[PDB]
Amino acid sequence: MNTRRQQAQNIRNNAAELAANRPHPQHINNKEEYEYRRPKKDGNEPSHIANFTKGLPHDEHTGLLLNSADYDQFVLGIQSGDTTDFARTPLGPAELPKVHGCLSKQKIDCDDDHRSGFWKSQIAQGAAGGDGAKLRAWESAGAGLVFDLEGPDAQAVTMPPAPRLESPELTSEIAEVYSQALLRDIHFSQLRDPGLGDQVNACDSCPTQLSIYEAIDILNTVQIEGQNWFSANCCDLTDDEQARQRPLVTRQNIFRGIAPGDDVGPYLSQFLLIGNNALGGGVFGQEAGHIGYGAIRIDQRVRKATPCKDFMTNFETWLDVQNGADLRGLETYVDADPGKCREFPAYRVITTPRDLATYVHYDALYEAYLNACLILLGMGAPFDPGIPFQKPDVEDKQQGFAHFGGPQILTLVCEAATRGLKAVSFQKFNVHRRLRPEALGGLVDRYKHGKGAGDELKPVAALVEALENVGLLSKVVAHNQLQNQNLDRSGDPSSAGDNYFLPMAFPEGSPMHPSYGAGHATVAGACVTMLKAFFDHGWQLNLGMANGKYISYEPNQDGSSLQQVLLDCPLTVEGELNKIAANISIGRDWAGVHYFTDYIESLRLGEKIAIGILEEQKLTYGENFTMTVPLYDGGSIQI
Amino acid sequence: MNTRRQQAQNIRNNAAELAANRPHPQHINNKEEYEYRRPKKDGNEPSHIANFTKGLPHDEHTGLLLNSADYDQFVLGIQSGDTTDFARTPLGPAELPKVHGCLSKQKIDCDDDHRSGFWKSQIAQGAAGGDGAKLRAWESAGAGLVFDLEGPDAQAVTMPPAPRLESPELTSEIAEVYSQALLRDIHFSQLRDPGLGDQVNACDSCPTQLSIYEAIDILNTVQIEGQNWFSANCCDLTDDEQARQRPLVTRQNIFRGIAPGDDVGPYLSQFLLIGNNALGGGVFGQEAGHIGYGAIRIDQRVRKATPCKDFMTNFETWLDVQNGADLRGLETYVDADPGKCREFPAYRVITTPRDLATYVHYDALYEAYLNACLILLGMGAPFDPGIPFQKPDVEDKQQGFAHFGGPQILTLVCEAATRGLKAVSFQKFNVHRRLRPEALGGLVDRYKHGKGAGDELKPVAALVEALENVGLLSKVVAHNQLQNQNLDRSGDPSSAGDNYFLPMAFPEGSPMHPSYGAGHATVAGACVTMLKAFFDHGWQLNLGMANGKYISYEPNQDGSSLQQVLLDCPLTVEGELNKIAANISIGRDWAGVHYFTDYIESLRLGEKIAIGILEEQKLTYGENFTMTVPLYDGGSIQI
Amino acid sequence: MNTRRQQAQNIRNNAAELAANRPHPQHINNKEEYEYRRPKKDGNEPSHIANFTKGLPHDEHTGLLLNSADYDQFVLGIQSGDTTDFARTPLGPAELPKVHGCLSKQKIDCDDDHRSGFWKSQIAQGAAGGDGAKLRAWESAGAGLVFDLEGPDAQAVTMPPAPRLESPELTSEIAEVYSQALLRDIHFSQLRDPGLGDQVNACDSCPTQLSIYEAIDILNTVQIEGQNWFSANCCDLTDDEQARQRPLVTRQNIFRGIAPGDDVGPYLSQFLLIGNNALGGGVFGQEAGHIGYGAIRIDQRVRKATPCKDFMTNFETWLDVQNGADLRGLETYVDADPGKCREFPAYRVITTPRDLATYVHYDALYEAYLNACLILLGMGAPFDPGIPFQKPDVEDKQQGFAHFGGPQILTLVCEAATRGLKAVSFQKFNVHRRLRPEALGGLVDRYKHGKGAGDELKPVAALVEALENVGLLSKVVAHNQLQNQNLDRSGDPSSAGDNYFLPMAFPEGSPMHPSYGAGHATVAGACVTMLKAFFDHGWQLNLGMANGKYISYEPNQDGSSLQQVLLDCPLTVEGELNKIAANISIGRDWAGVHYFTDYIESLRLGEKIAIGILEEQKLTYGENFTMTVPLYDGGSIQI
Amino acid sequence: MNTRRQQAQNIRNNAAELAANRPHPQHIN
């Protein structure tokens, strides 16, 4: 034998080498960054239209990137990871320099007590209680450079190159995000086959410019150079594309994930709706929506943001946000009904995607998957049989606590997320720098308003044709017109004219970090992988039965309680863990701050981080068990 | 420069060596294990009265350990960590062998469908719906042997030797636990100086055999060989004892922690009571008790266990539990009032220690400290200034997310706990093996009933004198008599006679692992250390003001809402994080499953695990900031 | 220079590092193990219907797995590799425990002199000369854990995930195995295009329920969810599936391998039929069937098992074998004709697949490929020109013996097999644990007899539909009925009713180790790879010519001698080494103990082991030659 | 425990050293 100090030190050095050995893949992007050129006096320069430029100086009249030098500075700051270099980047409204190539002069500084004059939108002008919206900087630019003690390194895993502005995939993805924005106040019961049960409409019925049927029709129709994304056969697509490609849009599979058990049952996962039976003598059931959070409860009722209210629907509102206008928590919420109990309808069940957008808006990183973990523990879910001390207490004469009990996993789901966020923070800033759906939504408007210099916005031409040829843009301008009749933005000049901008669920829209590499999806992909690995992934959730059919739950018309959907087969631990993983990830697409490619590839990335952690941790345990980890791409891996 | 693979691998090898270098202290116990001898035919053998023997064969008439060979087998199973050796240990009711030295024959096996006949208590006889209580094994016996990737190793830190049966300290600690058991249904408002505000009595007023005043009087009076624990000067005590020693029991400091800000304000920490203002346009305030859990809420209302109802109050009930009788969740809870909202009083605010016992009974490992973290985040707490990107967003041109934001800490508190549980699981099983307060409570009864062989229970004689000479036992027998009038245990023979057993808050009492090294306190000590380190520990929590005094909260008489306590100075982030750390840890002492020494030394251990993790993780970050970590023993360390 | 000790030690350390560096792939299965659930009192549990459970307690009435705890124990024994844990697994007929979760009580033990009463079948009841069949344990469970000095490690290579019960592939594979069972007594001349020569029928003509034409028709027709395996285009299939996929079943390519030269010429390889010319003055020719085994001969005549006699055709016979009933060598063989020479027809030429099943039943591991090696050496085959000292003896002034002669390869083919068997023994037990074709054959019967609990056998429903919709099952029940008229199993109750069981060529059917990872195919893939690498793979075997066409051989109607098949082009060393590799591997499919996926993926695995050995051994030789190794997937690699 | 790659590589290096250690006798004609 060795002394423990030696044994312990080796396990950490063994884990360190194991991680170093595993394939270190090469980071490849779509090359759109320096490809798309725009005119300057000496010649053509990079436009960076396809790139994330939110926070940088945006032309206050044109609406596009003011100076390319700010982007050149912005990149060199990320690549360096230097606090000095990244703070030399101009941020927010800025004036062009007199000498070409020089960095733009920042308008707002540490001597501006009042900032009202710098914003062209009313919402931003009277944001900070009359003073005017503050500037906000880029969130975790050099977090991709930060190392970790467990799991693979941030640059030891990669995501394949993103869709392009001219690609058929991208055109269908933005069309999906546009469709989701107009279906933001649809009742979740609508997003499934009607054979499952009677569907309902949201109690707060309001002006709708698009229906669920039209969205399916449009997504299957939309095509670039006579090719639709879903219709395109395997031969035409690349290896990295074939993996992502989906089938014809169905009423069941619309806006859903592509992992096992996503299509099965209602749209929304049970773990976002159901709770547990009240601790001890059950006062209420699982339909209650109160999770068994040890002794106390977790209320599953999300805050209700004012139905049918979108933001950044005109040029001024959009531009200001793209100039890092800090408009966090300026959205309005429904006041409570004094008569009703449980703060209703101020807090209600997730009825429409509007509520799912509100969920992912402020949710804690592991909250969604910790809650899912707690429901399974409270329900009494069997763990992956491979785990030791799983037999009867009398026979095995051992019980699972610290290393093979509830406590072990409760932390594992939390651990994985920070390992995950660092890994993707690299892909977002250092590698791809893909623009946010809102930014692309801007280009469509800017192009259709014939803005930009010479042939600057020529790349997006092909995209805008396809969207208008399926008559999607025709509805977006009609929707935006009604949204601009609101007193908060009616004073904004651009309200008068037509607006092709993507309606945002939040006033500030997306965060201050690039699109490709979803922060929510990487945490999801990592967290539920740990849950699936630890738990018995197959375990059919028995929520009772009614008339020889398995009971499942979804919101009711006003979100008062859950409504029964009776299925042929029951829902598994995996299926609902795979479905919640989609709900939170795709939930950002409903808000209009992510694409589909952002979800699926981040979900694959997060999984590799999670597996990597578990692989390294198996050196510690001396039992030499096995963990069956089901992958999102069919079959399962043994750990 | 190096390639990242090399850089990354070094940071993990550097962290691995750093941990190996830090002092590896020597594990020293009180030696009570093999000291206390009892008579056999050939001569004297180890009694193991001072040791944890819960689960092993206990003499069904005598009430003590049946065969020492079972303990000799039990130890060798722990020391080996072999699944085969630890499963060769006899568990539950057992028959003595015919050959002396041979292991006892187990009564209950995998052919006993019905087990009613093996239990001497009624509760256990009709436990498994008439079949009879199942056996339960020892939780994480070889978790102290399991290694880890971050933080110090399980055997790379130690806890000093526990109090002894003859020691003055132990006598005052069991007297504290006995007093807490009779004050289990006292209103928390009572546990503080009356100058702070008007105190109240619990709405469910019932038979009380001890008052708050008597408890203070008794704890200051109680003494062994003419020396009281609190009265004893520094000269008499050892270095390991001097650190633990407390002052004269005061109305303010009674049953509280000994960390900075424990004595200040009410007994119960704010983070167990208050929530946050409702997300967006606040429908309710912080007095509501709804935590800002992202978009959804966490209800601070704990399940109300039937007031003034204790368990293991007679020999039969106690013995069966000590024979690993699985009586989990057999305690009764109050049914809801149909008229009242928010499942009242089924779920209410933590009014009496009965509710704090119910909290720690089922609480998730990091729940208590995650909730505390969420309240601080929702309140808008400043982080430790040392952390980078803390300046205005315009000036610094960066924001904290993955590495120096909310997400970073949310996981850190969860990470630490599993690292902590393994470290103490060693101290519990492998090193000390100190008996649970219930086990000692048994010895007092067994001795006072003149049971045991010859001079077996002579060691506890001195203890039982001190408790009876302050007239504590005189009240315990009177309390137990009333508790044994309950129909569930009135049929049990020993109900007729006097009972000196410690009343347990749970039917199964303590878990199936030794006392010394508190599972709850090690997680607390580790978790809040991470919170204090990350957050600005000094930050005075401003919960408003009333009539020129700082507002603090505590439960009201029935637990309907929070009641205002107006303080001279306000409560800090540290003080309330140190107070909740005590509440959850000492909460087990109220249930009667832990001592004070179990809390304080585990709190010191947990802190060393937490600091150890943070020290190792600082190699990853390239910013080379500093974190100020305030210790429970006064001054702060810089990381 | 260095001293040899140093040089020699380095070559072994260099080889050791080379193996460690080569990609270590991740072991991924179909996840069917814990997916397919079945009902218990508390809820759903793993059925393990898709898993290998042969030897474990099988329900004596139901016919399925008795207790899942036995499987949970069986796995943990494999994963541990502990002699103690794997011997704690219940084996054979067993009684369910009284306590749920506890391991089943074994019926047969070391005090059962007579075991007749424990078997429900007559064959097994009077097996051990009246005493009754003995139990047999699992063959090499922890051989996948055993390391090796040359070649890659057992877990340093992997096999892709197996077909699923719901998959179109699996349905066509079991249909192929079912078809092979009814074509088990077809003359091998039938399994090729009639343009090659006049085909014949087996002299022992008997009841046939399926024809060669019907088998082709059925295999092309059979389909799940309107998709046939052979018909399915590349787009629908995965990367791991596309590699395995075959074309439309042709008379030439039916039941054949998919390596170069498999389809060319007759079904059966020459090396299973032909010998060499008698040493010195040839008394006989190569058509004789006497191999030039140095000075003595190897008779190519295989023992003739009684034509048209199958086993495990009813529930009792099947169940007993699935309960590890040791029925080895209870099959009957044809008695010799006293008049005829050369023990005829007791030993005859491999006429029908019945004989090829008998060959692979008892064959030595490398026998089939050593014999093939000896025929090539005796024929005078040129070695791979790359090998040194290959030129005329006068010019080169050297000859190949120890390092580049006949002796070198003779051992190489033998060496590779043990390296191969360990590699697959991991994939069988530790990774996949795929059920044997007989086990699946059972599920079809059990389902069609409406057995199992609730929705246990729902997964196989889809499979059984496809087989019955092509009218394959309709013939299987008719075939089984005639087989159950035999006096040995006519007394068995289930003989009266219909039987859907897969007819087994052996009484004991498959061995006691899981299906996926063929023991025969891994040895084949490894052995012939060494032969192809060493020999001149291209070398056209000249067995004379007749009427301007190249002569090839196949069995005659009674197996008296070989019959001439005249080809357009001659057969190569590679083609016949690739064809014998299939014959022995697919030979197990004819017996009904393997699928096609078991052959092809094991063939690919075995090749990687063989290449790995040769790569490591090239460090030893100082000549620095090259070896051209043709792969089964087209092109050749240089060593 | 170690990962198999490490365990496997050691067994081959251990075998290689074991052979090198065993007496290397002198070749006399």
Ligand SMILES: COc1cc(OC)cc(OC)c1
């Ligand atoms: C989900 O990502 C975030 C979005 C935010 O709103 C702009 C703020 C933030 O800081 C905690 C994180």
Ligand SMILES: COc1cc(OC)cc(OC)c1
């Ligand atoms: C707090 O420690 C525990 C106490 C328990 O009740 C016996 C069960 C347990 O398993 C999760 C842990």
Ligand SMILES: COc1cc(OC)cc(OC)c1
């Ligand atoms: C081909 O694999 C085997 C099959 C056997 O019959 C059950 C026995 C065996 O032991 C040598 C090996």
Ligand code: NA
């Ligand atoms: Na258990």
Ligand code: NA
């Ligand atoms: Na900030």
Ligand code: NA
């Ligand atoms: Na020669």
